[PDB]
Scaffold this active site. Structure first.
Site, PDB file in Angstrom:
ATOM      1  N   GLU A  35       0.823  -1.207   0.000  1.00  0.00           N
ATOM      2  CA  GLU A  35       0.000   0.000   0.000  1.00  0.00           C
ATOM      3  C   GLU A  35       0.859   1.259   0.000  1.00  0.00           C
ATOM      4  O   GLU A  35       0.543   2.229  -0.700  1.00  0.00           O
ATOM      5  CB  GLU A  35      -0.932   0.006   1.213  1.00  0.00           C
ATOM      6  CG  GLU A  35      -2.080  -0.989   1.135  1.00  0.00           C
ATOM      7  CD  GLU A  35      -3.119  -0.619   0.094  1.00  0.00           C
ATOM      8  OE1 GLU A  35      -3.035   0.492  -0.474  1.00  0.00           O
ATOM      9  OE2 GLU A  35      -4.021  -1.444  -0.157  1.00  0.00           O
ATOM     10  N   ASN A  46      -7.567   9.348  -5.783  1.00  0.00           N
ATOM     11  CA  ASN A  46      -8.443   8.417  -6.476  1.00  0.00           C
ATOM     12  C   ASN A  46      -9.246   9.140  -7.552  1.00  0.00           C
ATOM     13  O   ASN A  46      -9.347  10.369  -7.571  1.00  0.00           O
ATOM     14  CB  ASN A  46      -9.393   7.729  -5.491  1.00  0.00           C
ATOM     15  CG  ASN A  46      -8.654   7.000  -4.388  1.00  0.00           C
ATOM     16  OD1 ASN A  46      -8.869   7.257  -3.204  1.00  0.00           O
ATOM     17  ND2 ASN A  46      -7.769   6.089  -4.774  1.00  0.00           N
ATOM     18  N   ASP A  48     -12.448   9.222  -8.025  1.00  0.00           N
ATOM     19  CA  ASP A  48     -13.661   9.866  -7.541  1.00  0.00           C
ATOM     20  C   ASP A  48     -13.386  11.141  -6.755  1.00  0.00           C
ATOM     21  O   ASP A  48     -14.331  11.738  -6.229  1.00  0.00           O
ATOM     22  CB  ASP A  48     -14.470   8.892  -6.676  1.00  0.00           C
ATOM     23  CG  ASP A  48     -13.730   8.458  -5.424  1.00  0.00           C
ATOM     24  OD1 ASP A  48     -12.683   9.054  -5.100  1.00  0.00           O
ATOM     25  OD2 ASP A  48     -14.206   7.518  -4.752  1.00  0.00           O
ATOM     26  N   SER A  50     -11.465  11.352  -3.985  1.00  0.00           N
ATOM     27  CA  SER A  50     -10.976  11.057  -2.649  1.00  0.00           C
ATOM     28  C   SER A  50      -9.471  10.802  -2.685  1.00  0.00           C
ATOM     29  O   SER A  50      -8.854  10.701  -3.747  1.00  0.00           O
ATOM     30  CB  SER A  50     -11.706   9.850  -2.060  1.00  0.00           C
ATOM     31  OG  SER A  50     -11.427   8.671  -2.796  1.00  0.00           O
ATOM     32  N   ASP A  52      -6.124   8.664  -0.515  1.00  0.00           N
ATOM     33  CA  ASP A  52      -5.678   7.641   0.421  1.00  0.00           C
ATOM     34  C   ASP A  52      -4.449   8.138   1.167  1.00  0.00           C
ATOM     35  O   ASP A  52      -3.548   8.732   0.569  1.00  0.00           O
ATOM     36  CB  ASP A  52      -5.352   6.339  -0.310  1.00  0.00           C
ATOM     37  CG  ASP A  52      -6.556   5.751  -1.014  1.00  0.00           C
ATOM     38  OD1 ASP A  52      -7.694   6.022  -0.578  1.00  0.00           O
ATOM     39  OD2 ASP A  52      -6.358   5.012  -2.000  1.00  0.00           O
ATOM     40  N   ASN A  59      -8.800   5.866   3.141  1.00  0.00           N
ATOM     41  CA  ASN A  59      -9.438   6.734   2.161  1.00  0.00           C
ATOM     42  C   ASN A  59     -10.297   7.796   2.840  1.00  0.00           C
ATOM     43  O   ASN A  59     -10.895   7.562   3.895  1.00  0.00           O
ATOM     44  CB  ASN A  59     -10.289   5.892   1.201  1.00  0.00           C
ATOM     45  CG  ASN A  59     -10.985   6.723   0.140  1.00  0.00           C
ATOM     46  OD1 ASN A  59     -12.155   7.076   0.287  1.00  0.00           O
ATOM     47  ND2 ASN A  59     -10.276   7.021  -0.945  1.00  0.00           N
TER      48      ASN A  59
END
Ligand SMILES: [Cl-]
Ligand SMILES: [Cl-]
Ligand code: NA
Ligand code: NA
EC number: 3.2.1.17
Length: 129
Positions: A35, A46, A48, A50, A52, A59
């Site tokens: 990750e 991301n 959309d 958002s 992380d 998120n």
């Protein structure tokens, strides 16, 4: 901070993640590797809108507030920047909430695709725990 493999395992164990909800320590170390590459300062945007955050790439649509994800829920009740600290306490406490929400560690796409079904014990092999 960029952790060493065994350094992070020891920190996660002290914070109560070994076998938390039945997931052995090796699973949490494997997930962190893929990750964030063990880097607490990692961020990724991301599609959309958002973002992380941190060593476990939590998120902003559901779990933390970064002030720029409209309609987000902030279920861990923390600013997303707290997840980038060299102290992993905030990330661990939020991860515990995530892994208890019903879908286990499948919530982490990298765990499903690169750790699940593998010999995750190898990620703590050789460490003094
Ligand atoms: Cl393990
Ligand atoms: Cl993946
Ligand atoms: Na180490
Ligand atoms: Na949010």
């Amino acid at each position: 901070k960029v952790f060493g493999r065994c350094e992070l395992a020891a920190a996660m164990k002290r914070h109560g993640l070994d076998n938390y909800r039945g997931y052995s320590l090796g699973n949490w170390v494997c997930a962190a590797k893929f990750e964030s590459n063990f880097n607490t300062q990692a961020t990724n945007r991301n599609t959309d809108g958002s973002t992380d955050y941190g060593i476990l790439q939590i998120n902003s649509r559901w779990w933390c507030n970064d002030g720029r994800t409209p309609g987000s829920r902030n279920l861990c009740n923390i600013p997303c920047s707290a997840l980038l600290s060299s102290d992993i306490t905030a990330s661990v406490n939020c991860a515990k909430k995530i892994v208890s929400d019903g879908n286990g560690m499948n919530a982490w796409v990298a765990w499903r695709n690169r750790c699940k079904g593998t010999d995750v014990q190898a990620w703590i092999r050789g460490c003094r725990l």
